[PDB]
TrEMBL record, chain E:
The gene is Psmc6. Belongs to the AAA ATPase family. The chain holds residues 304 to 403 of 403 of the full protein. This is 26S proteasome regulatory subunit 10B. It is found in: Cytoplasm; Nucleus. It comes from Rattus norvegicus (Rat).
UniProtKB/TrEMBL annotation, chain F:
Belongs to the AAA ATPase family. It is found in: Cytoplasm; Nucleus. Component of the 19S proteasome regulatory particle complex. The 26S proteasome consists of a 20S core particle (CP) and two 19S regulatory subunits (RP). The regulatory particle is made of a lid composed of 9 subunits, a base containing 6 ATPases including PSMC3 and few additional components. Interacts with PAAF1. The chain holds residues 149 to 221 of 442 of the full protein. Component of the 26S proteasome, a multiprotein complex involved in the ATP-dependent degradation of ubiquitinated proteins. This complex plays a key role in the maintenance of protein homeostasis by removing misfolded or damaged proteins, which could impair cellular functions, and by removing proteins whose functions are no longer required. Therefore, the proteasome participates in numerous cellular processes, including cell cycle progression, apoptosis, or DNA damage repair. The gene is Psmc3. This is 26S proteasome regulatory subunit 6A.
């Protein structure tokens, strides 16, 4: 089963009489271990809220960051193992960069998501390599394709979501989204909401301690994936803290 | 294990478990069932709702590759020492 | 166990034990401390050798005219990775001709290290690297794991019994930021000595320093100017 | 009195039903249960629920319990007790 | 296995969207709550649910009320419950495959 | 009533009294008379896990009347 020397977790070419693939499933349990990364689609952009894990006492900003820029206007928030996430960042950024060069217009998220998923999926099929141990979101704003949110898991699926969570708290965190009307809503108000969801979900045993990182890609940034200002972070932090009490 | 605890000072030297100690699985012909049975019994009284009594334990394995994750963690395996080929 | 037969072997928790077990190899390596100010990046390292009747071969390696590394772990593997980095740094100097970014270089190591850990029938590399580099955005001192994740620290210690040294790093964490070159090196020595027992206090012979910064390029002091930093002795601060 | 012939049995449960306040249900190793008494006629010394106890075939009452956890006789015989091996 | 002792092979199979809707109302019936219309949310979210899972979400939701400090079940607590049990069951190991 | 245990004398046969239930020895030996508590403190950390465990087992046993009011099983 999990303790074995042939097939099961060694392979992923294996099937059980149920049909399952255990290795691809073990990769899914790996994304679960670290804290939540949420990314919410607005009709005007994407706002992310990520727990940025504080693994030491001698931190500087951007240390073990999970916010990546795939393209100029795509942000990528990862959850689960960061080792696998760095290799995934290089592959996604590379597919986007060449796209911009050739097509000369802003990469459609629907296209980018299909290509990275195929890559994850090529590894899950194979028993020759293991598959990535993280799950990620790509989120973007353009006026050539609209605001899009996509999610790619360790299996190799790409489907669009209008508000998603990956990481430990995601079953709880997702529920809070159904409460919110977020499909139509400014990116300014949604930052306040991603921050308050994270503060309440966190507990001292999903991970020791975190640093709040929120990111913009919307009408406010003018279609640029950038990190939120010091001002923005703090008011959204404040509202999270006041709601927490 | 019970007999060991009651007497005054016991050392149970579990001798040479290579495949007589192996990790839990089932083949549907007999399985690892009989092997794991001894293994599991030793786990239930040791940790239990009663702890290990007056029982010291020494393990001899040539294969830690075989063993169950339960045995390998401390509370019956406090210190690992390799007595292997010498210098 | 059989969560670590190959580096594709998952545990039910969802962790590869071989990559973790590769970190235990870094602990066998020699103690190295990485510190930064606002103008210098300083690497303080422990050199060991089999002949102490002979000069000890450096544990500080050349990567760029402003990048130097200190290795903790596997010696062959650290040198092996070093060559990929060296090729890229020197190439970056030809093409881009900036003083290359520590954050940029470090991610490329993350793609290569991932290859064997992803691949069956192979071993991870069990070496932890502390890189000092100075670009035009100031110093950065980065830690790269046996995995592929990086930390941008102000101070880090990976190596043998690195906890003892961190107790010092935690205590003067504020101080590092303000320093000049001299001050960075004395703190790293006071940290470095702690890893080792109470009754062992370093010599210049087994200390190599790689100094990087704004006022300087790349200079390695093996005993050259090591003696003044060592002075002002402090012996194993608890 | 009533020890020998002492048939090996074991205490299945402690009841207080039928006859005296101390009453026990022992099941003999022929697989029939018996409701037995308890003797002070000679001192019971090793009694515990589920442990082997001894009852008589003439009048079934516990004269003396069998020693602690001798349920396997098989394990106990083979064991050496601390021999001297020279260095 | 061959008929003449098992001529009728009736399989009590996994209850539908429509089936879950009526059964949840009955389940809803001893539950002290603010209100529940959430049946529709619960069915859409439910994947591979059998009768045991259905009774479970109702218990799991009531448990969250105790943390809240209310003997009245929130609408938020039913929604939280379906997703959670759904996630745990699939991830760990999926149901047994056998003739339907 | 059939299935209940009753005594009979093996030498000459009368039902002395009726005997109450009987639980075999093999299960009896395994049992415990309850051993000292380590509590939540000795198992330091593991906070989220403790919160789930306490909610499921401990609060329904003690405050079982409230749990009937919630309606839950």
């Amino acid at each position: 089963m999990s303790s074995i020397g042939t097939g099961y977790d060694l392979s992923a070419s294996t099937f059980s009489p149920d049909g399952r693939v255990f290795q691809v499933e073990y990769a899914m349990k790996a994304v679960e271990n670290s804290s939540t990364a949420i990314g919410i689609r607005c009709k005007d952009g994407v706002v992310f809220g990520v727990e940025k894990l504080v693994l030491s006492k001698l931190y500087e900003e951007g240390s073990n960051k999970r916010l990546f820029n795939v393209d100029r206007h795509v942000g990528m928030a990862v959850a689960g193992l960061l080792a696998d996430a760095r290799s995934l960042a290089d592959i996604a950024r590379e597919e986007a960069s060449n796209f911009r060069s050739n097509f000369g217009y802003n990469i459609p998220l629907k296209h980018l998501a299909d290509r990275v998923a195929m890559y994850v999926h090529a590894y899950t099929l194979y028993s020759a390599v293991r598959p990535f141990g993280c799950s990620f979101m790509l989120g973007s704003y353009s006026v050539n394709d609209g605001a899009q949110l996509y999610m790619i898991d360790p299996s190799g699926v790409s489907y669009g979501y209008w508000g998603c969570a990956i990481g430990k708290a995601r079953q709880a965190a997702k529920t809070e989204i159904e409460k919110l009307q977020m499909k139509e809503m400014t990116c300014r108000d949604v930052v306040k909401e991603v921050a308050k969801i994270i503060y309440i979900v966190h507990d001292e045993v999903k991970d020791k301690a975190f640093e709040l990182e929120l990111s913009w890609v919307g009408e406010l940034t003018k279609g640029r994936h950038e990190i939120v200002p010091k001002d923005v972070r703090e008011e959204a932090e404040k509202y999270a803290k006041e709601s927490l009490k | 294990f019970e007999m060991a605890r009651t007497k005054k000072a016991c050392l149970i030297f579990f001798d040479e478990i290579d495949a007589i100690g192996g990790a839990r699985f089932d083949d549907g012909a007999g399985g690892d069932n009989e092997v794991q049975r001894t293994m599991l019994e030793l786990i239930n009284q040791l940790d239990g709702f009663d702890p290990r009594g007056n029982i010291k334990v020494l393990m001899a394995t040539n294969r830690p590759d075989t063993l169950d994750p339960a045995l390998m963690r401390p509370g019956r395996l406090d210190r690992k020492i390799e007595f292997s080929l010498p210098d | 166990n059989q969560y670590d037969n190959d580096v594709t072997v998952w545990s039910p928790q969802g962790r590869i034990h071989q990559i973790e077990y590769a970190m235990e190899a870094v602990k066998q390596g020699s103690a190295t401390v990485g510190l930064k100010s606002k103008t210098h990046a300083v690497l303080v390292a422990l050199k060991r050798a089999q002949s102490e009747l002979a000069a000890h071969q450096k544990k500080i390696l050349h990567v760029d005219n402003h990048i130097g590394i200190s290795i903790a772990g596997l010696t062959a593997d650290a040198r092996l990775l070093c060559n990929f980095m060296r090729q890229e740094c020197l190439d970056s100097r030809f093409v881009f001709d900036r003083p290359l970014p520590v954050s940029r270089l470090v991610s490329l190591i993350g793609s290569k290290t991932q290859i064997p850990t992803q691949r069956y029938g192979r071993r991870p590399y069990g070496v932890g690297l502390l890189i000092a580099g100075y670009d035009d955005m100031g110093p950065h001192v980065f830690q790269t794991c046996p995995s592929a994740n990086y930390f941008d620290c102000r101070a880090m210690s990976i190596g043998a019994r690195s906890q003892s040294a961190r107790t010092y790093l935690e205590r003067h964490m504020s101080e590092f930021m303000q320093c000049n070159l001299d001050e960075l090196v004395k703190h790293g020595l006071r940290a470095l000595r702690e890893t080792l027992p109470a009754e062992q206090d370093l010599t210049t012979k087994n200390v190599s320093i790689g100094i990087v910064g704004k006022d300087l390029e790349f200079t390695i002091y093996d005993d050259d100017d090591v003696s003044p930093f060592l002075d002002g002795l402090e012996e194993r601060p608890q | 009195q009533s020890e020998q012939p002492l048939q090996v049995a074991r205490c299945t449960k402690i009841i207080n039903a039928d006859s005296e306040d101390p009453k026990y249900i022992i099941n003999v190793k022929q697989f029939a249960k018996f409701v037995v008494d308890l003797s002070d006629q000679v001192a019971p010394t090793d009694i515990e629920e589920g442990m082997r106890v001894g009852v008589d075939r003439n009048k079934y009452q516990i004269h003396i319990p069998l020693p602690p956890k001798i349920d396997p006789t098989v394990t106990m015989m083979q064991v050496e007790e601390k021999p001297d091996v020279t260095y | 296995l061959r008929p003449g002792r098992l001529d009728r092979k009736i399989h009590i199979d996994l209850p539908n969207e429509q089936a879950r809707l009526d059964i949840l109302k009955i389940h809803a019936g001893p539950i002290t709550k603010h209100g529940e219309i959430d049946y529709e949310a619960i069915v859409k979210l439910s994947d591979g649910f059998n009768g045991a899972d259905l009774r479970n979400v109702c218990t799991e939701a009531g448990m969250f009320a105790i943390r809240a400090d209310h003997d009245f079940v929130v609408q938020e607590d039913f929604m939280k419950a379906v997703r959670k049990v759904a996630d745990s069951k699939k991830l760990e190991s999926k149901l047994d495959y056998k003739p339907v | 009533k059939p299935g209940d245990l009753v005594g009979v004398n093996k030498d000459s046969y009368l039902i002395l009294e009726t005997l109450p239930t009987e639980y075999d020895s093999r299960v009896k030996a395994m049992e415990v008379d309850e051993r000292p508590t380590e509590q939540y403190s000795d198992i330091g950390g593991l906070d989220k896990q403790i919160q789930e465990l306490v909610e499921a087992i401990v609060l329904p046993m003690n405050h079982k009347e409230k749990f009937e009011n919630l309606g839950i099983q």
